[PDB]
Structures are given as structure tokens and as C-alpha cells.
């Protein structure tokens, strides 16, 4: 008999899952890193030529973290000195190389500690942020022109997001957007003057005698939020002895009236820009299409060019409103919005008309719009086979919504049921990325007749390797809760014995619009637990989960910690009846919202779970950030939703932990879910005379992802579970 | 059958040990709190009368935390609104109550948040500290006179100590001293301007949305230290419109030359004061006796009145240089110093001459000088039976040092071997306090006849309750390590069967001048471990331990973490050979320095210990305070002792932890041994791939003493030990 997938196999990634990352640079060509050099492929034929010899990297005096070729191909940025900040943010040093002269620009260099940098969409202009201010370099070798003067550490950010905007609104650090042709440079200014500071200790290397205190303007629920300003700069007049020509665009009056967020920016044409704003409440957003007035430099908005989007049952969009996809000429756009029935579908809008027309419909949802031509619209949805945890690429005819074809559905039906796509510049070619249920598969296709063209990466090596290991099997199925069909997944140990009662581990996320059940292939900790430790690992998507319509997703609106926690319990009760499950050994674990749900479940007193592990959990919503929290909970005031904020804390269920074995884990430098959350929960448990276990991870943040900490937590969690399940 | 002493019995103090706290107020009277009344006792004839009826307390309107009667018995101070700060410091509100007119002073009340307050030694003058400044009230009903104007939060302290002086030098918050007749008020001023701040999070009550950051000027080893100034205020001129008459006394040149500490103050007569100073190196201290010059108001210092004390093998004194005890006239004094053999004994000094004469001698040590009269000196020593862990009261005739009597040695030889004493004014009577090995016994005696007069408290009630429980016995004995005899104690389970093999827990402190082996009776966690769980708990005092001469104590000078750690290992190795120890089940635990030694031992790779628990340990000397650390280690510089600071960290031993089960515990609000110490240690263990267990305690300080935390830590450690010993 073979061997099993071990914890070390997981921790050291002994079984490599290959991928194929390419960067389109034209309607038919893409850059790809092979053996350290940047190759240039011609999708059409498959022939490649060298674009940058690995040799050039060696001659640089540092490790190249990332590269970015200019749109006209005359220059390339070299990113080094990478220093991570939050989830997307970081600082770095940059060198600009001249691909013509095949030399390295040395005059007027990009500054040290640059916060963000980007080429214009055409040519080779540059805009970057340094010390919270924006700078523009029209030519690599020329000196930069300062765009903003208000930048102030921890107070005013120009061109980059503050903490909450990076994490909860844009999911990006960048807040700069060049116009299609480089005339205009739009940017947002964030003002955190009145945002309270979260403070926590950072111990750093053993050599530091006194700990450092980290301070971050971070708006917790109901607190003062950062304010925002959007401007469009006319770069044509940037001159050393000239002022900066910029125009401030404000949101329509229906949002300007109170606290709001800027949630999206889309350039339509050189003279048309679409701004998307949302009220602080987040159930009311509006798109404002503004046109440039050549005679005054103003950006004008009109009531006819404005489009509202609200939600009466919940919040708008999944984590933010979906983005508008404009036609080439900008006279109309396609965007995903909720149906009359609550399902997210593509609607066609006239830029200056309010009524829109849905072009897709059904008891399923469009995930996103991937590409748009004059003739077609390509999108991703979970329509196929009615499985919401599946994803496929579809193409619909614009002049006939009856003609919709599925480009990926039948390519490899057993191996591939979960895809994402990447199209070349005018959608003439697309790369399909299959993430499971079988081994990932990357392939290239021509939009003309949808020919397979060629395989880019098929993971044959991993496949050869895995046939010698006793892998667990993954099965998806459905169970009915309160008249609704909900999906679950179970990772089952190899050589499954129906007569044996296996211990069961429930892995949970369960946050609003979460999806823990899908057909994605993963080599994870659960793979190990099932393969070597014979533990069945299962996940369930109940009320509050996404991609199945707003009736399901919005079910937990204003009441986080109720129906989603309850469904995890009821679903587990059903699993516990299966003959091959040892109902006396059921555990539950989760990270983040999953840690919160795990804790609420253990504190429910259901008698269904023997033990559980919460990693970096929210323990009280008033401790989490304003943007995410308020979106689902409203404000913690008696006039709004205070009662539901107060009875949804983990601390309120403290007494009930006397019935279970609990492991609470948290990184001390978590800037996201503050260590404070676990500190407050451990204290209430201690105050209740409840015994449990904890594990802090010094200086680790929300991902507890440094190499050693990562190995350590999974090793520590595996020992705790084995002890809970009486496993040798 | 019988009950055993349980964890709950320990945690809830079911078996109460009683004591008898009294306050001498004259040569033959003392106050005592009984049934909440303040009683006035007459030692002569044993009769008693009510000094303050408890009715008074009931009429107050707040919980009276404590009280202090004025020396002339006309007023009484009531302390309420007590709020603890560090180990000795706290703030409170105070009412003054007139005993004659049995009414409460309501005019010119003492301010709230007062930091320290004390009556003058005679009369009823008051001196108090508020907002870091000193104030004097000549009468309870009169407005106070401000004495200092430099008070400043976290910077300048007048009349009270800063953090390090409080914890390591004075072992008190108070820094003011009235002269015997109340003429002068001396006080020290501490300047923390250049002391770095230790910063850490305090989460507070669950309702606090954002954690607060605590900041304390705290000097770590080798860092900038607080500076001090000493003044004597002539209180006779205090008047609403008069300036403050004061004189600054500076240390002698030999100490003034560099960083130093004021370590003690002793009023000799109304016109003579003794200041004791020590160099930052702490192997050099000097006593400077200053005389008041009536014609100029200054306090004059002279070389003939200066006395130097140094140490060539280590530091001066035990934790500070011993204090001088002056005769009534102030022409000579008695003080404990190390003799030529390295044993601490009483030397008689002439105030204006440098040579002294020893009045005690032998291979044992004087612990302290308790009282002094024109004809006798009373002291406590461990001479009896040659056991360093025993304590007795002796009286030596001043005109004939060969004449010494032991006053407590034979009162109750079996029950009482560890005494402390408290003498009335002029040493006419003394209360004797017996702490073990039997149950505590408090007695009152007459000094003229040395008759026992009466038993104040004999704990006969506790004795009765304990006859019904299976109590463990405590045995003290000796072993030889490298040719030197050292003491150890073992708490043995009831019905100790010399033939069975019991698990063994080593409880360690082992810091410089520590004494974990004594004849004190204690109802502890260990009592429960022996009585209920049948675990032998042992302690051992090896190299570095105190009360056995400098050769033993100074053995670890400049090398903490070496010999005392090795001695714990070798002694246990010998214990494991005694026959009744299950060598497969030996553990070690300790708090503070003991937590440090516990960790160094586990990291030694001796294979002797299966597991250990360290509570709030030091992990690296450079992280601990300057006063304590430098005393034994010198400076962490390559010029001085850096090499020994560097290889004495627990982290340097991380790799050896892979062989043991370890539990690391620390309170997050520990202001003494910063959480940073365990946080840096766990980070090193994670980095080395070591699995271990952790337990933080939210908002708990160095004592992890809140009621619920106390129960929680011991319950958690019991579970861990029992699991390590395979005990159900
Ligand atoms: C205020 O003072 C009066 C005394 O003047 C207090 O009354 C005394 O209270 C104590 C404590 O309850 C009584 O003692 C008890 O005696 C029996 C022995 O027979 C013993 O079993 C108990 O353990 C305890 O020792 C004492 O007899 C009683 N004395 C008088 C004169 O009544 C009163 O309690 C005080 N007020 C408060 C509320 O503290
Ligand atoms: C950032 O926002 C703050 C408001 O919180 C602005 O501060 C105000 O500025 C005006 C004009 O300078 C003053 O009259 C107010 O007293 C300020 N209020 C506060 C709270 O300071 C600040 O000007 C904004 N900064 C930018 C660049 O827009
Ligand atoms: C907070 O309180 C609400 C209202 O009492 C709880 O909602 C109820 O939950 C029970 C389930 O035990 C249902 O049977 C009721 O119908 C619910 N009432 C409402 C108004 O919907 C809610 O569960 C509590 N939240 C938490 C996290 O405990
Ligand atoms: C730090 O290093 C010193 C020097 O090597 C250690 O002291 C030696 O310890 C060995 C083994 O116990 C003895 O045999 C040597 O005689 C010691 N040398 C000296 C000069 O003392 C010391 O133990 C180390 N400190 C720690 C905590 O490991
Ligand atoms: C838009 N805009 C600007 O352009 C601008 C500016 N501040 C400056 N300078 C700051 C110090 N040097 C001189 C002024 N300029 C540049 C400028 C202004 C007017 C004429 C020429 C150049 N601010 C604060 C601004 O908001
Ligand atoms: C398991 N889990 C989560 O829970 C989760 C999550 N992403 C989010 N949010 C969207 C991105 N930014 C804010 C958080 N959460 C929800 C959450 C995280 C932490 C605290 C509270 C809620 N992901 C990607 C995830 O895998
Ligand atoms: C010793 N001494 C003092 O006495 C003193 C003082 N500061 C004051 N006052 C502060 C505000 N009111 C007036 C001055 N006084 C009191 C005082 C000085 C001179 C005559 C009368 C009263 N300082 C700083 C000082 O060191
Ligand atoms: C067990 N243990 C200790 O260890 C200890 C101690 N007292 C001290 N020092 C003297 C008084 N105040 C400062 C510390 N330490 C030694 C120590 C404590 C914390 C860190 C490093 C050394 N006590 C009374 C004690 O019982
Ligand atoms: C550069 O490319 C060559 C093939 O063109 C390859 O053999 C070589 O390994 C590469 N250099 C490296 C190791 O970066
Ligand atoms: C591919 O080959 C064709 C010739 O058929 C050539 O024109 C084209 O430039 C090549 N592209 C690359 C990048 O190799
Ligand atoms: C801009 O101003 C600077 C002032 O030093 C001057 O040297 C430069 O020539 C000016 N630019 C022009 C040509 O207008
Ligand atoms: C939007 O949310 C707010 C909660 O702050 C609520 O009061 C308001 O009625 C909501 N509007 C809609 C359309 O439901
Ligand atoms: C004790 O009795 C003596 C006389 O016998 C008396 O002077 C004294 O005041 C009494 N003490 C008390 C406090 O009762
Ligand atoms: C405190 O010390 C600083 C130097 O560290 C000095 O500047 C300051 O004046 C001192 N303050 C007092 C009141 O002694
Ligand atoms: C002190 O001076 C004040 C006025 O400044 C006056 O009212 C008061 O009477 C004076 N007190 C004395 C003791 O002279
Ligand atoms: C006191 O310590 C210093 C510095 O560590 C040392 O140089 C000196 O020799 C010591 N003094 C004596 C008398 O040992």
C-alpha cells in the first residue's frame, strides 16, 4: 500500500500545482515568464521570441519582485525593495529600463519608498505616489511634476487608499486612474483626520529593546469615517512653472447629502468618465457619467446620465456594487444587478435613459462580465448544471439575447467545472483557466470559432506524482433546510469504509456572500486530515451564502451570527445521522468570519460539537471595521440596530463553552481583525470560569502567513484535533 | 475515607489561616481592628477599650479601605476610592475625622486621586502628594501649603517614586520623610525626562471600542535612568504668602561622579539625617550623615561622617545595602555588612570614625536589626540549629557582645522555627510572629521579663478543620553539590509510601538571594498537588541563593542563567535517584525569575524533565529593568558584560525545547516583566519549529491576581501537569 498526503506534504508543498500566468499586451500577443526571461508569444501561431533576456535581471543589483512593461513597449519598470504593508499595499523602489537602448535610465529616478506607480494606458507616461502625494513623469528621464501638496502621514492620502478603502472598498491600494489616451489622470484624496486610531504593539526582531506601537487610522463600526474627494487632472498643462489644472467631481445630491464612499471609477472615452458612489448605509448607490466641457475644463453631470441602484432587502452588489461595462462609443453599458426575483443578471443600460433591459435571466447568477465587443458580451456564471459552486464562460449575442453559447461547458466536463478567463485586447483570444474538480488546466482559444488552439499547462507532472499517493475524494451534494436546497461538500478519507464511524471536521466561513462549497481542486490541510488522519472534512453554504440569489444571501441582513450559525448546526445534525460519521466526535473550525461562526456555534449549547478552533475571529461587531460591518448591520445605535449588535457577541455565550474544548488563535499584529477581539473574548471566558486554550502568534498579521508561523499553527491545530478525536 | 486538600479548597481559601495585625502607638498600647471597631489595647495589663465604634464606619457612606490615626490621637484618616497602580502605588480619596468632636472635617478636604499621604510622626500635621507635587496641612481644617511646583505626569515626581524606584529600590511608592519631631520634611524628586517608555495595550472593559495604550517611563538594562534630587524642607516657615525654605543635599563626590541611586533615608535626630547612596554599578555605596547648621539652614556633610561599603565579589547587600540603625544620640550606629568571611553580620560604627566592630559572627547571617535601646539590640537571624531557612529573635547586650539571648528559639521548638517580631515604642513589649513549620502563632511579650503575657492568635480552629483532611507533610533536608551542602524541601503526599514511585514537580525561584526552602507553613497549590493528586513537590536553594554567605550568593555574579540553573538540574537528578521518584514523570515550574530558570532548565537538554510551565518569565536580560538586572549583570556592552547577556537568553536554547512539553503564560498588562518577553520567546520557538503551549491573560499584571484570573491560571496549570503525568 502506498503512502498518504501528509501534514509535511501540505506545509512544504511537496506536490507542486502548476499554473500559467500571462499578460496580454495586444489583441494577439502576450508576455510570459519562462526560465526567468520575459517571452513574447503570438497567440495565433504559438511561436515565441525573447522580449527580455534573463541576463538583464542578473545585471541588476537586487531581486526583481515584479516588472511592468509600458504600453508602447519602449520601457519597463523594475520593482524591488518590496515592503508589504496591508493586504494589497506596500512600498518599493523602481528602476526604469529603456528597451530600445537596452540600457537602464539613471537620471531623475523614481523615489525610494514609492507607494504606487503606473504607466499611462498608451505611450509611456508615469504617475506615482510618494509620501502620500502624486507625481507625474512624462518621460522616464525627465523630472517629475508634483500633482498634490496635501499628503500627510496617517492623515491625507492622494492617489492611494487609506486602510478601510484598501481592504473593504477597492480591494486595492491604488486610487489613480489614467484616461484611455493619457490626457487626464483621475485620483481620489482620502481624509482620515477624524478617524480614530487602532494601536497595538509590534515587537520586531529580538534585538529591539523596547516594543514599537503601531497606529493606524481605522474606523470601527459607527465611528467617524475617512472622507473622500475625486479630481480629474488635465496633464496637458503640467509644466515646472505651471499650476496644476484639476477639477473636483462631487457625487450627485442624493449621496452628497450624507456620509458616502467612492466605490468605482471607469473611463468611458477620453472625455467621458463614470463614477460610482454609494451612501454610507450601502443599500443605495448611483452611477454618475460625467462629460468633459472643452470650453471650461469642467466635468459635467446631468440627471439623465445618472443611474440609481438600491436594495430593500439588503445591500447593493456582492461586496460592492458591480461595475459598469461600457460600449466602445460610450452610449450604453452593461452591468450586473439583482432581478425582480433576486438573481444577479446582466442588464443593458442606455447612458442617458433610466430603464434597463435584462439580457440574461434564470434561477442562477452571472458572476461577472469578462469582455465586450460590438457584437458580443462574454460573461462568467454558475448556470451550468444548476450548480452554484461551478463557473463557466458564456458568450451572448448583443443583437439577439437568444443566442448564448457556453465556451467552456463541454471542453472537459469531468475535469473542468470551474473556470475564469482572460481575453486579449479586442477579445480576439482568451485563455481559459480551469481550477477543478480535476487538476488545474490552462488552455488558449481563438474567439473566431472557439478553437482549442493549444494547452498551456496541464499539470501532467502533478498527476504522475499523485497516482502513487492515497488521495481523499471530494463529493458535493445537497440537503434541504427549511424547504430550501443548500449545498455541502465532504472530503472523504481514502479506501472509505462505510462500516467505520469517522470523526468529522466542519470547516466554516459562512459570512455574507461566502461560498465554501465549490468544484475547485485544492491541496489543503483538510486533504491531509482526510488522507492520513481519516477525518472527514465538510463545509456547508446556508443562509447568507452567495451566488444563489438575494433571498438566500440577504437572509442574514441586519442579523449577523443568527441564521448562518444556526444552519451550520442543523446541517451538521443531518451529517451526524449518516452511518459513517461518529456523531460523538464532531469538531468545527474557521478563520475570520469562519472563526466567529465557529465560536458562536460552540457557544450555542447545541451539544452537537465536541470541540473547535477559532483563528483570528471577530468576537464583537463594534470592534470590526465600519465599511464591512455596517453594510450588513447598520449602525450600533438604539435608533438603528444596536440590539442585534449586542446579542450577537461571542462573549454573550461564554457560559456555554464549559461544554466544549476550545482553541482560540490570533496574530498579535493583526491590523484587520484586531488582537483586541480575541483578548476581549478570552477575558469574558476567564470571567465565566471557562477553561479553554489559546495561542498567540507574535508579530503575525491576519494571515499568520510567515513560513514558520504557517507551519506552526497547522501543526498545533492538528495536535489539538487529534487529541479531541482520540487519534494517535 | 477523608477529604484531601482540593484545588477548590486552595482557590477559594476554604481553610483560613488567621493572623493578628496590630499597630503600636506608644510604649505599651496598640490599635487593633476587631468586628470593624478600632480597639485600643494595653500591653501592660492586657485590658482593652473601644477607640472608634464601628457605628462610625456605617455612617460614612463608602467602603473604608483603610485608616490611620494621628500620633496625638486627635484625628483619624479614612482611605476610600482605592485604585491600585503598580506593586505598592495607588491613589485614593481621604476624609479626616475629628475624634474629639466626633465629626468629619469638610473644609479644605484632601483632594481625590491623592497619591500618598502621611501624618507627621508627632502631632497631627499631614503631608500628601497630588499630581506629583507635595502639600502640607498644619491642621486638618486649614488650607494646605504647596511645597513643590515641578510635578509633571510621567516626567517629574516629587514625594513619590517613579516606576523603577518603586519596584526595585524603595519597595515603596512613598519618597518623603518627616523628622522625629515634625520640624523638617525631607523628600526625593525623580526626573524621568530621558527614560524610554514601555508601551503596551490595555483592552479594558468589553464596552471600550478602541484599546488604550499604556506608557510608563521604564529603564531597561543599560538604558537612560531616572535622576534624583533630595531636599529637606523646614516646615516651620510654611505660610500662605511665604516661599518654601528647603535645602538640597547632594551625594558625596565618589558617587556624584556618575549615575547613582538614592537608596535609603534615616532620620537620626531633629538635626541629623543619614542618606545612603549607591553607584549605578551597585558594588559601591556610601552613607553620608548630615548635620543641620542652625545659623544658615543648611545640612552639612563631612568626610569623617561618611562610610563606604563595597563588594569585590558581587553587589552590596541582599537587594539593596542594609540600613543603619542609630543610637538615640546619633553618635554611633549598627548595620549589617558582610564580614571577612563573606557572612552578613552586625557591625557597630562610630558615626564619625571609619572602622567598625562586629558584634555577631559565625557561619550564618543576621537577617535584620529590629529594635535598639541604650542597652540592647534585637535582631533576627538564621543561627538556630544552623538552618538558613529558619528565623529567630535574639537580644544582644550592648556593653557585652558575648552576652546574647535567643528569645524565641525555645518557646515552641517543634511548631515554631520561623519568626518575625514587632516592638512597641522603646522596645518595652514585642509581638512575636511564628509562621511555621506548624500553624501560625501570634504572641505578645514583655521585654523586661521576657514573659509571654498572652497568646493573641493560635489558629486552633484551623487545626481542628485540618484534622479531618489528608494533609501532606513538608520535609526539609540537605544534599551536597560540588562539595557544598545545600537545602531542599519536599511536600509529600499523605501516607507517603517510601516504596512507591511518585511524579515530582520542582517549584523554582532560584534568583539571586532567593530562598525557596524554609520552615514557613503554607496552604498552596503544591499542597493540593500533594494531598489530592499525589505529586511530590520539591524546591532547592543552590548557588546564588541567599542567607548562606556571599560565596554561595555571589556565585552567579555577572552570569545569571548559569550555575543556579545547573544546580536545579543536578539536585533533581539526585532527587530522581532517591527511589520514590518516578523519573519518567518530573516537571518544573516557576513564576518570574522562576519562570526564567524553568525555561533555561527545559532548554538545557538534560533529558531530566518531561515538561514545565513558566509564568511571566524573563526571557532576555536586556528586556528587564536597569536597577535589578545591572545589579547582577553589569552593562550589556562589549566593554562590560554583553557576552553573558547574549548567551543567557532563553531564545538561544529554543532548539532543545523540541524534547519537552512546555506551557508559557503571561498577562498582557504586565508592567514589570513585559508581555514582550514571552512574545519574543514564543516567536523564537515558532522560528525553530518548536511546538509548545501558550496562555495569555488579558489585562492581567505581573501577579495575574484578579479573582477569576487566579482561579483560571491554577486550574489551567493543573490540567496541563495532570495531562503531562498521565493523571486522570
Ligand atoms: C460592631 O461591633 C459589634 C461589637 O461591639 C459587633 O458585634 C459582635 O459581632 C461578632 C461577629 O459577628 C460576634 O462574634 C461572634 O461570636 C460567636 C461566638 O459565640 C462566633 O461563633 C462568631 O464567629 C463570632 O465570633 C460578637 O458576639 C458580637 N458582639 C456583640 C457585643 O454583640 C458587630 O458585629 C459590629 N458590626 C458590624 C456589622 O461589623
Ligand atoms: C480634512 O478634513 C478635516 C475635517 O476633519 C479638515 O479640517 C478642517 O479644516 C478647516 C479649514 O482648514 C478648519 O476650519 C477646521 O477647523 C478643520 N477641522 C478639523 C477637525 O481639523 C481638513 O482641512 C481636511 N483636509 C483636506 C486636505 O481636505
Ligand atoms: C438576538 O435576539 C433575537 C431576537 O430575540 C434572536 O432572534 C430570534 O431567534 C430565535 C432562535 O433561537 C427565533 O426562534 C426567533 O424567531 C428570533 N426572533 C426574531 C426577532 O427573529 C437572535 O437569534 C439573537 N441573536 C443571536 C446571535 O443570538
Ligand atoms: C555562556 O558561555 C559561558 C562560556 O562558555 C558558559 O560558561 C561555561 O560553561 C561550561 C559548561 O557549563 C563550563 O564548563 C565552563 O567552565 C564555563 N566557562 C566559563 C568561563 O564560565 C555559560 O554557561 C554560558 N551561559 C549560558 C546560560 O549558557
Ligand atoms: C493646484 N495647486 C497648485 O498648482 C499648487 C499648489 N501649491 C503650489 N505651490 C506650492 C509651493 N510652491 C509654489 C506654489 N502649487 C503650484 C503652482 C501654483 C500657482 C502657480 C504655479 C504653480 N496647490 C496647493 C494647489 O492646490
Ligand atoms: C473566511 N473568509 C472571510 O471571513 C472573509 C474573507 N473576506 C472577507 N471580507 C471581504 C474582504 N475584506 C474584508 C473581509 N471576509 C469576512 C471577514 C473577515 C474578517 C473579519 C470579519 C469578516 N475571505 C476571503 C475569507 O476566506
Ligand atoms: C521654593 N519655591 C517657592 O517657594 C515657590 C516657587 N514658586 C512659587 N510660586 C509659584 C506661583 N506663586 C508665586 C511663586 N513659590 C512660592 C513663593 C516664592 C516667593 C515668595 C513667596 C512664595 N518655586 C518654584 C520654588 O522653588
Ligand atoms: C519568584 N520571585 C522572583 O522571581 C522575584 C521576587 N522578587 C524579585 N525581584 C525583587 C523585587 N522586585 C523586583 C524583582 N524577583 C526576581 C525577578 C522578578 C521578575 C523578573 C526578574 C527577576 N519574588 C518576591 C519572587 O517570589
Ligand atoms: C536563461 O535562459 C536560458 C535559455 O534561453 C536558460 O537555459 C537559463 O537557465 C536562463 N538563465 C537563468 C538560469 O536565469
Ligand atoms: C511569429 O512568426 C510570424 C511568422 O509567421 C512573425 O511574423 C511574428 O512576428 C512572430 N511572432 C513572434 C512574437 O514570434
Ligand atoms: C521656469 O522657472 C525657472 C526658474 O529658475 C527657469 O529657470 C526656467 O527657465 C523656467 N521655465 C521656462 C523656460 O519658462
Ligand atoms: C437603507 O439602510 C438604512 C439603514 O441605515 C435604512 O434605514 C433605509 O430604510 C434603507 N433603505 C432601503 C431602500 O431599504
Ligand atoms: C487598663 O487598666 C488601667 C488601670 O487598671 C487603666 O489605667 C487603663 O486605662 C486601662 N486600659 C484600657 C485601654 O482599658
Ligand atoms: C529633568 O531633567 C532634564 C534633563 O534630562 C532637565 O532638562 C530638566 O530641567 C529636569 N527637570 C527638573 C525639574 O529637574
Ligand atoms: C496672603 O495674601 C493674600 C492676598 O494676596 C491676603 O488675602 C492674605 O490675607 C495674606 N495672608 C497672610 C497670612 O498674610
Ligand atoms: C565594581 O564594578 C566595576 C564595574 O563592573 C568594576 O570595574 C570594579 O572592579 C568593581 N569594584 C570592586 C571593588 O570590585
Curated annotation (Swiss-Prot), chains A, B:
Disulfide pattern: 347-356, 406-409, 416-434, 611-724
Extracellular-side positions: 1-728
Glycosylation sites: 47, 54, 112, 141, 181, 191, 241, 283, 647
Residues in the signal sequence: none
Modification note: The soluble form (Dipeptidyl peptidase 4 soluble form also named SDPP) derives from the membrane form (Dipeptidyl peptidase 4 membrane form also named MDPP) by proteolytic processing.
Matching Gene3D superfamilies: alpha/beta hydrolase, Dipeptidylpeptidase IV, N-terminal domain
Purpose: Cell surface glycoprotein receptor involved in the costimulatory signal essential for T-cell receptor (TCR)-mediated T-cell activation. Acts as a positive regulator of T-cell coactivation, by binding at least ADA, CAV1, IGF2R, and PTPRC. Its binding to CAV1 and CARD11 induces T-cell proliferation and NF-kappa-B activation in a T-cell receptor/CD3-dependent manner. Its interaction with ADA also regulates lymphocyte-epithelial cell adhesion.
Organism field: Sus scrofa (Pig)
Protein's UniProt name: Dipeptidyl peptidase 4
Location in or out of the cell: Cell membrane; Apical cell membrane; Cell projection, Invadopodium membrane; Cell projection, Lamellipodium membrane
GO cellular component: a single term: intercellular canaliculus
Family note: Belongs to the peptidase S9B family. DPPIV subfamily.
GO molecular function: aminopeptidase activity; chemorepellent activity; dipeptidyl-peptidase activity; protease binding; protein homodimerization activity; serine-type endopeptidase activity; signaling receptor binding; virus receptor activity
EC number of the protein: 3.4.14.5
Subunit and partners: Monomer. Homodimer. Heterodimer with Seprase (FAP). Requires homodimerization for optimal dipeptidyl peptidase activity and T-cell costimulation. Found in a membrane raft complex, at least composed of BCL10, CARD11, DPP4 and IKBKB. Associates with collagen. Interacts with PTPRC; the interaction is enhanced in an interleukin-12-dependent manner in activated lymphocytes. Interacts (via extracellular domain) with ADA; does not inhibit its dipeptidyl peptidase activity. Interacts with CAV1 (via the N-terminus); the interaction is direct.
Topology of this chain in the membrane: Single-pass type II membrane protein
Catalytic activity: Release of an N-terminal dipeptide, Xaa-Yaa-|-Zaa-, from a polypeptide, preferentially when Yaa is Pro, provided Zaa is neither Pro nor hydroxyproline
Active site residues of this protein: 592, 670, 702
Organism domain of life: Eukaryota
Regulation of catalytic or functional activity: Inhibited by GPC3 and diprotin A.
Keywords: Aminopeptidase, Cell adhesion, Cell junction, Cell membrane, Cell projection, Disulfide bond, Glycoprotein, Hydrolase, Membrane, Protease, Secreted, Serine protease, Signal-anchor, Transmembrane, Transmembrane helix
GO biological process: behavioral fear response; cell adhesion; endothelial cell migration; locomotory exploration behavior; negative regulation of extracellular matrix disassembly; negative regulation of neutrophil chemotaxis; positive regulation of cell population proliferation; proteolysis
InterPro entries named in the record: AB_hydrolase_fold, DPPIV_rep, Pept_S9_AS, Peptidase_S9_cat, Peptidase_S9B_N, Serine_Prot_S9B/DPPIV
Amino acid at each position: 500500500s502506498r503512502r498518504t498526503y501528509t501534514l509535511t506534504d501540505y506545509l512544504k508543498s511537496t506536490f507542486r500545482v502548476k499554473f500559467y500566468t500571462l499578460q496580454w499586451i495586444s489583441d494577439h500577443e502576450y508576455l510570459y515568464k519562462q526560465e526567468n526571461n520575459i517571452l513574447l508569444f503570438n497567440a495565433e501561431y504559438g511561436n515565441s521570441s525573447i522580449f527580455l533576456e534573463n541576463s538583464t535581471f542578473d545585471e541588476l543589483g537586487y531581486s526583481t519582485n515584479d516588472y511592468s512593461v509600458s504600453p508602447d513597449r519602449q520601457f519597463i519598470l523594475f520593482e524591488y525593495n518590496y515592503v508589504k504593508q496591508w493586504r494589497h499595499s506596500y512600498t518599493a523602489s523602481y528602476d526604469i529600463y529603456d528597451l530600445n537602448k537596452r540600457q537602464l535610465i539613471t537620471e531623475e529616478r523614481i523615489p525610494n519608498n514609492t507607494q504606487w506607480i503606473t504607466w499611462s494606458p498608451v505611450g509611456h507616461k508615469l504617475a506615482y505616489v510618494w509620501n502620500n502625494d502624486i507625481y507625474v513623469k512624462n518621460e522616464p528621464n525627465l523630472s517629475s511634476q508634483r500633482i498634490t501638496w496635501t499628503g500627510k502621514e496617517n492623515v491625507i492620502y492622494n492617489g492611494v487608499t487609506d486602510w478601510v478603502y484598501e481592504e473593504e472598498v477597492f480591494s486595492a491600494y491604488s486610487a489613480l486612474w489614467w484616461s484611455p489616451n493619457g490626457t487626464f489622470l483621475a485620483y481620489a484624496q482620502f481624509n482620515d483626520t477624524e478617524v480614530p486610531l487602532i494601536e497595538y504593539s509590534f515587537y520586531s526582531d529580538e534585538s529591539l529593546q523596547y516594543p514599537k506601537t503601531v497606529r493606524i487610522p481605522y474606523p470601527k463600526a459607527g465611528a467617524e469615517n475617512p472622507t473622500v474627494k475625486f479630481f480629474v487632472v488635465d496633464t496637458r498643462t503640467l509644466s515646472p512653472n505651471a499650476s496644476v489644472t484639476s477639477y473636483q467631481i462631487v457625487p450627485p445630491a442624493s449621496v452628497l447629502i450624507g456620509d458616502h464612499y467612492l466605490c468605482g471609477v471607469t473611463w468611458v472615452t477620453e472625455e467621458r468618465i463614470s463614477l460610482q458612489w454609494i451612501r454610507r448605509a450601502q443599500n443605495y448607490s448611483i452611477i454618475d457619467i460625467c462629460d468633459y466641457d472643452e470650453s471650461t475644463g469642467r466635468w459635467i453631470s446631468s440627471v439623465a446620465r445618472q443611474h440609481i441602484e438600491i436594495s430593500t432587502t439588503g445591500w447593493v452588489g456582492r461586496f460592492r456594487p458591480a461595475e459598469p461595462h461600457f460600449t466602445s462609443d460610450g452610449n450604453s453599458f452593461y452591468k450586473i444587478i439583482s432581478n425582480e426575483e433576486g438573481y444577479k443578471h446582466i442588464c443593458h443600460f442606455q447612458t442617458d435613459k433610466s430603464n434597463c433591459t435584462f439580457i440574461t435571466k434564470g434561477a442562477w447568477e452571472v458572476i461577472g462580465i469578462e469582455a465586450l465587443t460590438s457584437d458580443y458580451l462574454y460573461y462568467i456564471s454558475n448556470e451550468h448544471k444548476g450548480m452554484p459552486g461551478g463557473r463557466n464562460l458564456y458568450r451572448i449575442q448583443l443583437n439577439d439575447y437568444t443566442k448564448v453559447t457556453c465556451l467552456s461547458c463541454e471542453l472537459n466536463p469531468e475535469r473542468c467545472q470551474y473556470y475564469s478567463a482572460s481575453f486579449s485586447n479586442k477579445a480576439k483570444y482568451y485563455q481559459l483557466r480551469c481550477f477543478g474538480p480535476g487538476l488545474p488546466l490552462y488552455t488558449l482559444h481563438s474567439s473566431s470559432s472557439d478553437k482549442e488552439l493549444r494547452v498551456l499547462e496541464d499539470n501532467s507532472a502533478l498527476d504522475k506524482m499523485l497516482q502513487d499517493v492515497q488521495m481523499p475524494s471530494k463529493k458535493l451534494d445537497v440537503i434541504n433546510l427549511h424547504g430550501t436546497k443548500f449545498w455541502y461538500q465532504m472530503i472523504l478519507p481514502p479506501h472509505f469504509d462505510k462500516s467505520k464511524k469517522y470523526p468529522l471536521l466542519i470547516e466554516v466561513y459562512a459570512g455574507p456572500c461566502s461560498q465554501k462549497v465549490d468544484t475547485v481542486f485544492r491541496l489543503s490541510w483538510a486533504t491531509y486530515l482526510a488522507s492520513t488522519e481519516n477525518i472527514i472534512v465538510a463545509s456547508f453554504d446556508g443562509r447568507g451564502s452567495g451566488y444563489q440569489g438575494d433571498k438566500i444571501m440577504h437572509a442574514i441582513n441586519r442579523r449577523l451570527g443568527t441564521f448562518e450559525v444556526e444552519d451550520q448546526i442543523e446541517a451538521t445534525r443531518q451529517f451526524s445521522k449518516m452511518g459513517f460519521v461518529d456523531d460523538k466526535r464532531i469538531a468545527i473550525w474557521g478563520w475570520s468570519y469562519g472563526g466567529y461562526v465557529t465560536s458562536m456555534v460552540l457557544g450555542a449549547g447545541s451539544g452537537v460539537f465536541k470541540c473547535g478552533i477559532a483563528v483570528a475571529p471577530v468576537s464583537k461587531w463594534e470592534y470590526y471595521d465600519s465599511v464591512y460591518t455596517e453594510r450588513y448591520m447598520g449602525l450600533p445605535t438604539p435608533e438603528d440596530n444596536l440590539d442585534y449588535y449586542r446579542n450577537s457577541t461571542v462573549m454573550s455565550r461564554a457560559e456555554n463553552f464549559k461544554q466544549v474544548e476550545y482553541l482560540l488563535i490570533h496574530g498579535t499584529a493583526d491590523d484587520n481583525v484586531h488582537f483586541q477581539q480575541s483578548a476581549q473574548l478570552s477575558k469574558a471566558l476567564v470571567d465565566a470560569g471557562v477553561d479553554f486554550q489559546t495561542m498567540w502568534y507574535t508579530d503575525e498579521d491576519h494571515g499568520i502567513a510567515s513560513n514558520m508561523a504557517h507551519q506552526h499553527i497547522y501543526t498545533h491545530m492538528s495536535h489539538f484535533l487529534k487529541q479531541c478525536f482520540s487519534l494517535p
